[PDB]
């Protein structure tokens, strides 16, 4: 059972130096191809532009993109997905001056460069095949 | 030296179940009568109404109040202020359905009952005689 509802839409204010810390557990085993998605939305409205979408295909790869004027830009990917089958994970997204740094269980896996300033992000949505224990926003 | 600037004005969205976790250190010894203040503001504008003001007189007492239509209401106080002279403290404010619960270094010291809904709080300001290490907002 999830501590928070999923999809989880969290109003936020982000600045350089912020960290979003998401703790949860996949609800399906990896042979069932579960996913996790995190969106940095510019408004509560889910059709608003997205500064950074992060979609993990557990045991497979992560696909990242951004949506500008309603148009998806060029996808970025990495095969580095150090999540453990069936276990709680800790996903940290650090807002640096040039990029979002993504850490999985303390392991840096990617840096997604800002194409709009991160202070334009007003909502973080956590969605798909996870039970959500906690979400924190720290400075 | 402070990790964050003081006064620290943090835009927030709070709901029942939120926790504001403030870590920092008094910048004066207790014989010099330092203070710490935390405000739950309804807007970024510091003349907006205040759902909950928390002002610690270290080694002495805490005074709490709220400001409604620009008018300060009746002060509430407790003498329970378990902060240590010269040390880092952890101040947690939990948003429950009926009250803000205030914890100092894990110790519950007070419950300040809501007179407006906590979701009306849009800014948290941390101010006065502290160096601020971190501020987190968790759900």
Author numbering:
A (entry chain A), B (entry chain A): 1 to 139
Text taken from the publication that reported this structure:
Galectin-13 (Gal-13, a.k.a. placental protein 13 or PP13) was first isolated from human placenta, and its gene has been mapped to chromosome 19q13.1, which is in close proximity to the galectin-4, -7, -10 and 1412 genes. As with all other galectins, Gal-13 adopts the typical “jelly-roll” fold formed by sandwiching two anti-parallel β-sheets that consist of six (S1-S6) and five (F1-F5) β-strands and a short α-helix connecting strands S2 and F5. Gal-13 crystallizes as a dimer with its subunit interface formed by the last five C-terminal residues (Val135, Cys136, Val137, Cys138, and Asn139) that are located within the F1 β-strand. We found that Gal-13 forms a homodimer structure that is stabilized primarily by the presence of two disulfide bonds, unlike the structures of other prototype galectins.
We crystallized wild-type Gal-13 and its R53H mutant using two different conditions. The wild-type lectin was crystallized in a solution containing PEG 4000. Our Gal-13 structure shows that Arg53 protrudes from the base of the carbohydrate binding site, and the characteristics of an arginine, including its size and charge, are obviously different from those of a histidine. This difference suggests that wild type Gal-13 should not be able to bind galactose, which likely explains why we could not find lactose bound to Gal-13 in crystals exposed even to 50 mM lactose. Even with 50 mM lactose in the crystallization buffer, our Gal-13 structure lacks any electron density that is expected for a bound lactose molecule and only shows water molecules in the ligand binding site. However, our research shows that galactose, maltose, xylose, arabinose, glucose, mannose, lactose, fructose, sucrose, and cellulose do not inhibit Gal-13-mediated agglutination. Moreover, our biochemical results indicate that Gal-13 may not bind carbohydrates, a proposal that is consistent with previous work demonstrating that Gal-13 purified from human term placenta contains no carbohydrate at all.
